[PDB]
Design an enzyme around this catalytic site. Sequence first.
Site, PDB file in Angstrom:
ATOM      1  N   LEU A  15     -12.782  -1.019 -47.258  1.00  0.00           N
ATOM      2  CA  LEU A  15     -13.481  -1.447 -46.017  1.00  0.00           C
ATOM      3  C   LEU A  15     -14.110  -2.626 -46.618  1.00  0.00           C
ATOM      4  CD1 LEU A  15     -13.825   1.386 -43.602  1.00  0.00           C
ATOM      5  CD2 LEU A  15     -12.286  -0.236 -43.363  1.00  0.00           C
ATOM      6  N   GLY A  16     -14.770  -2.287 -47.696  1.00  0.00           N
ATOM      7  CA  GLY A  16     -15.869  -3.317 -48.225  1.00  0.00           C
ATOM      8  C   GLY A  16     -16.743  -2.878 -49.692  1.00  0.00           C
ATOM      9  N   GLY A  18     -20.361  -3.603 -51.899  1.00  0.00           N
ATOM     10  CA  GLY A  18     -21.874  -4.077 -51.787  1.00  0.00           C
ATOM     11  C   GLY A  18     -22.464  -3.903 -53.016  1.00  0.00           C
ATOM     12  N   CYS A  19     -23.739  -4.339 -53.135  1.00  0.00           N
ATOM     13  CA  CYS A  19     -24.555  -4.069 -54.253  1.00  0.00           C
ATOM     14  C   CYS A  19     -24.607  -2.835 -55.066  1.00  0.00           C
ATOM     15  CB  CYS A  19     -25.884  -4.863 -54.056  1.00  0.00           C
ATOM     16  SG  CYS A  19     -26.179  -6.258 -53.586  1.00  0.00           S
ATOM     17  N   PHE A  20     -24.327  -1.680 -54.265  1.00  0.00           N
ATOM     18  CA  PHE A  20     -24.220  -0.394 -54.905  1.00  0.00           C
ATOM     19  C   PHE A  20     -23.372   0.616 -54.656  1.00  0.00           C
ATOM     20  CE2 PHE A  20     -28.952  -1.632 -54.181  1.00  0.00           C
ATOM     21  CZ  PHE A  20     -29.382  -1.517 -55.298  1.00  0.00           C
ATOM     22  N   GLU A  22     -19.069   0.973 -52.760  1.00  0.00           N
ATOM     23  CA  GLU A  22     -18.131   0.439 -51.878  1.00  0.00           C
ATOM     24  C   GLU A  22     -17.857   1.430 -50.703  1.00  0.00           C
ATOM     25  OE1 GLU A  22     -15.176   0.888 -55.560  1.00  0.00           O
ATOM     26  OE2 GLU A  22     -14.583  -1.045 -55.022  1.00  0.00           O
ATOM     27  N   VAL A  23     -16.777   0.973 -49.673  1.00  0.00           N
ATOM     28  CA  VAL A  23     -16.656   1.955 -48.722  1.00  0.00           C
ATOM     29  C   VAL A  23     -14.939   1.974 -48.356  1.00  0.00           C
ATOM     30  CG1 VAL A  23     -17.480   0.170 -47.365  1.00  0.00           C
ATOM     31  CG2 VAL A  23     -17.064   2.608 -46.261  1.00  0.00           C
ATOM     32  N   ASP A 128     -34.252  -0.134 -44.613  1.00  0.00           N
ATOM     33  CA  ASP A 128     -33.203  -1.393 -45.152  1.00  0.00           C
ATOM     34  C   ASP A 128     -32.601  -1.658 -43.671  1.00  0.00           C
ATOM     35  OD1 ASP A 128     -32.226  -3.545 -46.351  1.00  0.00           O
ATOM     36  OD2 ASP A 128     -31.356  -2.340 -47.687  1.00  0.00           O
TER      37      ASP A 128
END
Lengths: 275, 4
Positions: A15-16, A18-20, A22-23, A128
């Site tokens: 699905l995506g 990011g900086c830390f 995946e999903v 955040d």
Amino acid sequence: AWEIPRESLRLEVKLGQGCFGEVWMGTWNGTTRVAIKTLKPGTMSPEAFLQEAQVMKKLRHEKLVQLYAVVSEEPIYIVTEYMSKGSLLDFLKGEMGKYLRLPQLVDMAAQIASGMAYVERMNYVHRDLRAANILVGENLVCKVADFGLARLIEDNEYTARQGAKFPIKWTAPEAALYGRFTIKSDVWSFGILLTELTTKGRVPYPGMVNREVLDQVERGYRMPCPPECPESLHDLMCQCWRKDPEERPTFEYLQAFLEDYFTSTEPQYQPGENL
Amino acid sequence: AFXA
């Protein structure tokens, strides 16, 4: 302790990233649709994470992405409710962004404020809040994700609240400078979020670098009213950006103001080119 | 964090 066997999960579709981590979209126990967020090893303590997860599990509200289960061994898996339309930031920047006008954006903000009002009622702190960490579903539903993770991150520069991974531009000055994270620093971030919503996902403080932002904001600088954004909505942002954290509005207030916006505040609204 |  909400801990599950890693093999009870099937990570099916990406699905995506990011900086830390995946999903993925997937299945839990071969029956339940879920999302699985997967953390880069070295990002946070499994024990510290497991402890915080017990708190994350208690946050049950229609506008907060629900935690289902965790795998605390690295790579840490976080198993949650699945939202089909991706991050709000990408949503705003993408093809649908062009079809959103002020009434949709204000309603999305109101939904986010509702989830954050629950967090506020529960005496917790997100740390955040920004469009990158909000999720979109069918019928323009928006829910707040990733509550409780920010505090746990151990990235070198990040713990110094510096570097490319720390969202200085979205963070209240007292939090960015001093690490004083409270529901009121979340309110500041919500103000920045309103700017993201009304600028279709543009970075905050365009053309400014992180240190310049911190210096200027300390001196009283605040982002201006976006084109086609009513001044009353910019006023709300400015309330969220009050220097004194105690004088910023509550999420309870933000939710109600936004829900009532087009009858109590701007009943004379006319659609423009963008908003 | 997971979505950039």
